[PDB]
């Protein structure tokens, strides 16, 4: 019963119980196309679920690498990092399976195809953040998903569309952080920002706010990366 699982996902969201929420939207997906609303539920849920593990992973990885002259503590940090990393990989794998098995094949409109292919790039990028022989394949999958999303979005979405801007944002981050390619990262971010500038004049107040929020993040990264 899809509508019951959705209403439960919405309660979980209000309750900030994102593991519960993600389980609900996973089950909704394992039916077989998501509304604008259900798509953002799935996205919000997994972003928070994986986000908690990414944050924990960064902190414990930092402790693992910094600890000196305390071998048992260092080992405990390594083992805890590995446990967190296993959770994180399991989350990414689940999301990537939903995308591959259900979401991307059934996506009928360009808006949802770009959304899901961006999501695919994102969760392969999150795997690439932690991958120390599988890394090259993971990175190639991230790049290809982002590029597929990028080409559709360039043809079918306005430059101010938040999904097109957010794709450019995350793809630029992929280039900077994962591929260590700051020049390509800056090019993607600056061009997306400048293409959107051209057309902000046409937007309503709400759409203007939507677009400029992502544009601010683009500018913020460009400022960081060029200092």
């Amino acid at each position: 019963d899809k509508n019951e699982l959705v209403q439960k996902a919405k309660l979980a969201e209000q309750a900030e119980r994102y593991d519960d929420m993600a389980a609900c939207m996973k089950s909704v997906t394992e039916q077989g196309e998501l509304s604008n609303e259900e798509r953002n539920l799935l996205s919000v849920a997994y972003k928070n679920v994986v986000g908690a593990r990414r944050s924990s992973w960064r902190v414990v990885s930092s402790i693992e690498q910094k600890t000196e002259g305390a071998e048992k503590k260092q080992q405990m940090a390594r083992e805890y990092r590995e446990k967190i990393e296993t959770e994180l990989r399991d989350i990414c794998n689940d999301v990537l399976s939903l995308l591959e098995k259900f979401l991307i094949p059934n996506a009928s409109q360009a808006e949802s195809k770009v959304f899901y292919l961006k999501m695919k790039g994102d969760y392969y990028r999150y795997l690439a953040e932690v991958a120390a022989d599988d890394k090259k394949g993971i990175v190639d999958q991230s790049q290809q998903a982002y590029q597929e999303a990028f080409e559709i979005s360039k043809k079918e979405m306005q430059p101010t569309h938040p999904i097109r801007l957010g794709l450019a944002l995350n793809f630029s981050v992929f280039y900077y952080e994962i591929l260590n390619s700051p020049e390509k990262a800056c090019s993607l971010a600056k061009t997306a920002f400048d293409e959107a500038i051209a057309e902000l004049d046409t937007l309503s107040e709400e759409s203007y706010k939507d677009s400029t929020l992502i544009m601010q993040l683009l500018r913020d990264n460009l400022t960081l990366w060029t200092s």
Partner: peptide
């Protein structure tokens, strides 16, 4: 680096 929030 900042990445995209949700909408």
């Amino acid at each position: 680096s900042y990445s995209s929030p949700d909408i």
